[PDB]
């Protein structure tokens, strides 16, 4: 129904970035290092309000099958993060 420019007051409150296209994603490495674990559809401040603070969280756990490998000597199922210790 309507037609549309963008409100001049709101432009001044943010808009023209942009930085170079070829550095875009690499650019985040530095602050990612300072940033704690984030989930796509688990909001950080709601996890803090409504869940225990040392709660375990696997996002979308049934999305893909379990990621494991089986030891050749003992035949144990090992989580990827446990394999290297198991082996030494």
């Amino acid at each position: 129904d309507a037609e549309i420019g963008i409100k001049p007051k709101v432009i001044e409150e943010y808009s023209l970035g942009s930085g170079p296209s070829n550095d875009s994603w690499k650019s985040l490495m530095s602050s990612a290092k300072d940033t704690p674990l984030q989930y796509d559809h688990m909001n950080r401040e709601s996890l803090k309000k409504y869940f225990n603070p040392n709660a375990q969280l696997i996002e979308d756990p049934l999305d893909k099958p379990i990621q494991y490998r089986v030891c050749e000597k003992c035949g144990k199922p090992l989580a990827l993060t446990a394999i290297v210790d198991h082996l030494e």
């Binding site: 989930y39 559809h41 688990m42 909001n43 709601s46 996890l47 409504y50 869940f51 225990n52 040392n54 709660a55 375990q56 969280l57 696997i58 979308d60 756990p61 049934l62 999305d63 893909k64 099958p65 379990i66 494991y68 089986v70 030891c71 000597k73 003992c74 035949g75 144990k76 199922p77 090992l78 989580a79 993060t81 446990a82 210790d85 198991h86």
Partner: protein, 441 residues
């Protein structure tokens, strides 16, 4: 009853007590060690009449005389000379001829071979119990398993648990290192069997043996409850974390970082809405009354509700005014995996057990936002497992269902595994429901 006073008498003199015991044994020994012919001729031949087997034949306790019964020849011998005690040579039993009866109820006489040690025996051992004397007792059947097994399937298909097991924590820490001794090592074995490679599912059997030894109520057809086993099992995992630690409170173990929530009961000022008192109660599952309900969210509702207290008139600091405090319950803290029990069992103190049959509608995605305290975004859990009971309270079995990765449901009916639609899994009358946190806005 009473005892032969004549023998009781003689037993007051303790040199003549040892006398009749020595003689009882001498006799019996002879009886047990005499060739039939010598037995017949020298213990069954009557002295007065010379007949063999003129009925019972009795060796006198005081002389060497032998008297038959049928011609009252031991009765005569006891008349005078006066010797009133005889031992029947067929059986060793002691007869009193004034009592006209057998002395059968004197433990010392029955058990004369322990004569020498009798006082240590009287005081350091007792006669058998009335109800144990014949060893009668039932022995229970241990094929009652499905209340333990359906739970295990839920745990074996729960992703927080698999991650824990397959990450080797317990195995790196356990001091016992044996599936027959340690409960946790038994679970690791089940995981090793189901998911890994061998080097027969003994995992469940080891786990049973560990279980029944730790708590024998877990055995037999005593109608045990799948829920009770849930609590039991998660408790054991916790107990194992606490034991492997070197040396108010909130625990870092798998059970306590995955399944624990907390309820909040508080007194709120109906004026300024600030909470005046707040008590917080941890939980590992929630139990939901289902009488007359028809949908899981109607059960959760009655759970989190406001109550006008009629006996709490108080002063609000914040207001500041006099209020009749409202009480409200609501979840303070949600678990990573939420476990719900629909209450279907009344095991009454008037013995008989009833199961509620009611179908209750449960969703594949469950939004817990309304049941939380203090504006609350969507908190959505994904249904990953169900434990069900069918049919009758005492001849029924528990069945587990589990969503695996990619969305297939399976039905576990020990030990038949079978595929199953979701449209059907939802038709079950759920007893336990397992939900795992999927979306938090």
């Amino acid at each position: 009853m009473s005892i032969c006073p004549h023998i009781q008498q003689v037993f007051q003199n303790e040199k003549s007590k040892d006398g009749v015991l020595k003689t009882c044994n001498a006799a019996r020994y002879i009886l047990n060690h005499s060739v039939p012919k010598e037995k017949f001729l020298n213990t069954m031949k009557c002295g007065t009449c010379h007949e063999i087997n003129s009925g019972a034949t009795f060796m006198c306790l005081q002389c060497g005389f032998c008297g038959c019964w049928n011609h009252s020849h031991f009765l005569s011998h006891s008349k005078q000379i006066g010797h009133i005690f005889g031992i029947n040579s067929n059986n060793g039993l002691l007869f009193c001829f004034k009592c006209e009866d057998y002395i059968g109820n004197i433990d010392l006489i029955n058990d004369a071979i322990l004569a020498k040690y009798w006082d240590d025996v009287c005081t350091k051992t007792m006669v058998p119990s009335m109800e144990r004397r014949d060893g009668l007792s039932g022995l229970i059947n241990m094929g009652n398993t499905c209340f333990m097994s359906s739970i295990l399937q839920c745990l074996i298909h729960n992703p927080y648990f698999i991650r824990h097991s397959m990450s080797q924590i317990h195995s790196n820490n356990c001091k016992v290192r044996s599936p027959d001794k340690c409960f946790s090592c038994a679970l690791d074995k089940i995981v090793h069997e189901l998911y890994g490679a061998l080097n027969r599912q003994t995992g469940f059997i080891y786990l049973l043996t560990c279980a029944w030894k730790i708590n024998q109520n877990l055995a037999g057809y005593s109608q045990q409850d799948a829920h009770e086993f849930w609590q039991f099992i998660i408790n054991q995992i916790h107990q194992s974390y606490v034991l492997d630690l070197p040396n108010n409170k909130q625990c870092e173990c798998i059970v306590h970082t995955v399944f624990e929530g907390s309820l909040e009961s508080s007194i709120v000022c109906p004026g300024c809405q600030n909470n005046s008192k707040t008590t917080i109660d941890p939980f590992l599952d929630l139990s939901l009354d289902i009488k007359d309900k028809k949908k899981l969210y109607e059960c959760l509702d009655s759970f989190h509700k406001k109550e006008q207290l009629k006996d709490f008139n108080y002063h609000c600091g914040e207001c500041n005014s006099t209020q009749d405090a409202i009480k409200q319950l609501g979840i303070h803290k949600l678990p990573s995996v939420l476990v719900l029990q629909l209450k279907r069992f009344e095991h009454l103190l008037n013995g008989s057990n009833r199961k509620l049959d009611d179908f209750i509608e449960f969703p594949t995605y469950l939004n817990m936002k309304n049941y939380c305290s203090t504006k609350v975004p969507d908190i959505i859990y994904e249904l990953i497992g169900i434990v069900s009971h069918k049919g009758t309270v005492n001849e029924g079995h528990y069945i587990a269902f589990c969503k695996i990765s990619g969305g297939q449901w399976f039905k576990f009916n020990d030990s038949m595994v079978s595929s199953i639609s979701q449209e059907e899994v939802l038709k079950e009358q759920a007893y336990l429901l397992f939900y795992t946190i999927r979306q938090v806005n």
